Amino acid sequence: GQKGGQAIVVHPDYLYGAITEDRYNEYVAKVSAREKSAYKFFHNGMIY
Amino acid sequence: FQKPWFATVNGQARDLATMTYEEVAKRLVELMFIRSTNSWFDVTWRTFTGDFLRRVEERFTKSK
């Protein structure tokens, strides 16, 4: 029933260009904090 | 107490789940290996830390 749709998705590193060294380095440290916490909960929730 | 809490690095209280494999191995040697006599207090404690290092190898290696 005539349902056209186009999505454009762009490589994420293009975002980080538009901010400062400081906010990026702040971001990286918190993503590192996400990653370890996320890894724990997933493998925890998987096996039980 | 004479048996402390295991999951403590640099005097910060953690849980065993919130440690790195590195931090555990360091903590194991800190309690089971003696600096004054330059020896493992009991041979079984060496085995324990040894098996844990094997486990680390087992986890992270890709090929045989």
Curated annotation (Swiss-Prot), chain A:
Post-translational modification: 4'-phosphopantetheine is transferred from CoA to a specific serine of the Acyl carrier domain by the C-terminal PPT domain. This modification is essential for activity because fatty acids are bound in thioester linkage to the sulfhydryl of the prosthetic group.
Organism superkingdom: Eukaryota
Physiological role: Fatty acid synthetase catalyzes the formation of long-chain fatty acids from acetyl-CoA, malonyl-CoA and NADPH. The alpha subunit contains domains for: acyl carrier protein, 3-oxoacyl-[acyl-carrier-protein] reductase, and 3-oxoacyl-[acyl-carrier-protein] synthase. This subunit coordinates the binding of the six beta subunits to the enzyme complex.
Similarity annotation: Belongs to the thiolase-like superfamily. Fungal fatty acid synthetase subunit alpha family.
Additional record remark: Present with 17000 molecules/cell in log phase SD medium.
Quaternary structure (record): [Alpha(6)beta(6)] hexamers of two multifunctional subunits (alpha and beta).
Protein name as it appears in the record: Fatty acid synthase subunit alpha
Organism: Saccharomyces cerevisiae (strain ATCC 204508 / S288c)
The organism's taxonomic lineage, starting at the top: Eukaryota, Fungi, Dikarya, Ascomycota, Saccharomycotina
Gene name, Swiss-Prot/TrEMBL: FAS2
From Swiss-Prot, chain B:
Function: Fatty acid synthetase catalyzes the formation of long-chain fatty acids from acetyl-CoA, malonyl-CoA and NADPH. The beta subunit contains domains for: [acyl-carrier-protein] acetyltransferase and malonyltransferase, S-acyl fatty acid synthase thioesterase, enoyl-[acyl-carrier-protein] reductase, and 3-hydroxypalmitoyl-[acyl-carrier-protein] dehydratase.
Quaternary assembly: [Alpha(6)beta(6)] hexamers of two multifunctional subunits (alpha and beta).
Family the entry assigns: Belongs to the fungal fatty acid synthetase subunit beta family.
Miscellaneous comment: Present with 91800 molecules/cell in log phase SD medium.
Protein name: Fatty acid synthase subunit beta
Source species: Saccharomyces cerevisiae (strain ATCC 204508 / S288c)
